[PDB]
Design a protein around this ligand. Sequence first.
Ligand SMILES: [Co+2]
Ligand SMILES: [Co+2]
Ligand SMILES: [Co+2]
Ligand SMILES: [Co+2]
Lengths: 74, 74, 4, 4
Amino acid sequence: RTITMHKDSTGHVGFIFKNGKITSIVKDSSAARNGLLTEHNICEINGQNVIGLKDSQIADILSTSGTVVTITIM
Amino acid sequence: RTITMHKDSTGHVGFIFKNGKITSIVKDSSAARNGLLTEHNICEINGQNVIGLKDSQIADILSTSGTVVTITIM
Amino acid sequence: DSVF
Amino acid sequence: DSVF
Ligand SMILES: [Co+2]
Ligand SMILES: [Co+2]
Ligand SMILES: [Co+2]
Ligand SMILES: [Co+2]
């Protein structure tokens, strides 16, 4: 349930989340091409367990990540 | 060059912008269905001229708008 | 970035 | 909302 994505020229892989759960996918994005889908909880980012982290704490992980971002969902 | 959109259940019409210019479209969104496209400058929102407003000032207009949001682009 |  |  692990997806590898790559940031675009604006620094985004292409998803929106809330309460730990993916809610929207950006058109023409890495998230779109790699088949990330709404309504699933985020379990890991770059192999780190993020279950139970606050959205701002997940956002910090995402924003500070380098170009490649791997995400595991439940 | 005027598009009428409708906020979804998360309160979004489905676009990202920077420096007054649309940069991304959300999949399955009102912006997508109504044919908003990247790389154009935002001229008006709900009939108000926003040329020259800061991104935060455009964001306030968008966020405080009711359900229907009309946008004109150059 | 912010979505609207 | 924020996009990532
Ligand atoms: Co599923
Ligand atoms: Co054009
Ligand atoms: Co951003
Ligand atoms: Co929002």
